[PDB]
Amino acid sequence: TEIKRMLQTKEDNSKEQFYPETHVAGIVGLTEYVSGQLPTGVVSVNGK
Amino acid sequence: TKIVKMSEKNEHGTLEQFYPETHAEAVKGLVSVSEEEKTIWDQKESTAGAEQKANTALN
């Protein structure tokens, strides 16, 4: 699929882009993206 | 790969996913089981049987 950006005609003439506000439940793969970027640092210190 | 979730329109204006009916040879890379080789490798060199054989050999 392809993603688009929604413009709108401003007061005088400018076709300015505006953003729609959304919800975390409406993002397709943000859970997987965040889990992949979860900062797995030190697994354990002295085994703990 | 190109995996799609086949769906069809409901009887009341919505959409529902359906799985189709395929064959074992229809699937690719499924590495089937002969329904017989499982029986032949059920026994092989069993673990409990090995312990029992060791115990009875000692006896």
Binding site: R5, M6 | M6, F18
Partner: protein, 190 residues
């Protein structure tokens, strides 16, 4: 009635165990009977509603055709222009110019989605535009138009078999048709 079954928070399998299980069975039976009665009530309700709708259709047809029969053999040599001043929602206008003027003023405020980049610059005040930025492959679910179980005589006909428990969510939905020269093709193997 609302179903409220008894759980098993007890400790010993005894009198309360049997009593609660038998009460659960009785409640299940009662709820099943209630659901069947509800289905019958739905059938009779929709039948009555359709019957009264049909009766209203018949009587309005009689009245309207009587009005038209009054129109015929009465006034003679009618004109198209005066007839044209009445719109489709039964709103009369003084002059046909007034009707066209009001229709233009009502319709000129509607929006127009502009997908291409070149047509966005020439879009009006009440318009929005959406131009492509990037494309994601992703995994998509397809709703085949000519594939239906409830309707026969379709290009592909499917009959239901034993449903499998647990279901998932459709992602990246798409509508299309399947067949020759369509987006989704079919051909035998071998």
């Amino acid at each position: 009635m609302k179903l409220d079954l008894w759980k098993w928070e007890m400790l010993l399998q005894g009198r309360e165990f049997r009593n609660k299980t038998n009460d659960n069975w009785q409640k299940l039976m009662d709820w099943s009977d209630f659901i069947s009665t509800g289905l019958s009530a739905i059938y009779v309700y929709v039948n009555k509603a359709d019957a009264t709708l049909n009766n209203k259709i018949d009587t309005v047809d009689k009245a309207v055709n009587a009005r038209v029969n009054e129109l015929i053999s009465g006034t003679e040599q009618l004109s198209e222009v005066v007839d044209a001043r009445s719109d489709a929602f039964g709103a009369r206008y003084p002059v046909l110019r007034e009707r066209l003027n009001q229709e233009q003023l009502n319709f000129s405020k509607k929006s127009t989605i502009q997908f291409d980049a070149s047509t966005i610059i020439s879009m009006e005040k009440q318009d929005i535009g959406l131009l492509t930025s990037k494309k994601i492959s992703e995994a998509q679910t397809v709703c085949f138009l000519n594939i239906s179980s409830l309707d026969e005589e379709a290009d592909i006909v499917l009959e239901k078999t034993g449903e499998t428990s647990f279901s998932d969510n459709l992602t990246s939905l798409v509508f299309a048709k399947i067949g020759t020269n369509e987006r989704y093709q079919m051909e035998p193997v071998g």
